[PDB]
Amino acid sequence: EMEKEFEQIDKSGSWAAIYQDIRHEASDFPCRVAKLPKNKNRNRYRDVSPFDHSRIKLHQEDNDYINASLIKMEEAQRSYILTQGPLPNTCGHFWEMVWEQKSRGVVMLNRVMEKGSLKCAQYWPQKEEKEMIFEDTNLKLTLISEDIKSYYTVRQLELENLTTQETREILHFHYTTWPDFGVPESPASFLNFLFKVRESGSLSPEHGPVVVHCSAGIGRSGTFCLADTCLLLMDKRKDPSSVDIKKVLLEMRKFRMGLIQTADQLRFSYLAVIEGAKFIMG
């Protein structure tokens, strides 16, 4: 039971300790391809790399590298591609991935600029009339419409394969109110955002995996994936109270390092799941 485990830890300030156990137990696999000199400019951060076993490969024979990991949750039957906020030189790669993997949605959990510096390139067009063209991966992207709201914005985009002239509609789910430091006071809006993403059908099997990212694609992105999955499991099992969030986090960490960067995010994850649970039924 987590609802209880929560308070047991809160009034004991053991969050930092728990988080560390998880850090210690977490798996570690090689990232040999990510470290090759030729991909130095394909990584935003030197110490956030995709393991080789689970990395997303680009269908180009030149350089199939991109800092992106496939997180496959067998039991919950859900997959997610967690990636880093793209770089000024990897946007064409990013959309190539979205195309090749047949993704339907892109979930963005950060802003282009935070704490005064760029945390992600401006990879999507901001004005209907100014479409972007990525010449290296031969892709065209057009802003079709956007719906700006209190805590988030949803955009409909048209991605076209210039080689084939085939078009596809991608939904951009951009959470715009994640705080500069710390985590939200209330998981409330984050849960609404999540459900909003589920509702679009972007997390569904008939589509390629959803593309999720913040700046490094492991902290906030981790809380998103960890919350979704845990909620899905509490919904699928005979015994809902059998869902161990730490267990799930560790399973996800087999596919990508550092998912959930601080003890705060972990606490927040608990909160989002606990809150989301008291609502998936009434």
Ligand SMILES: O=C(O)C(=O)N(c1ccccc1C(=O)O)c1cccc2ccccc12
């Ligand atoms: O982008 C992330 O994965 C992330 O969650 N980061 C954070 C790390 C600690 C506390 C808060 C956050 C946050 O995003 O709110 C990171 C932000 C910027 C650079 C990072 C570099 C490596 C790992 C995590 C990073």
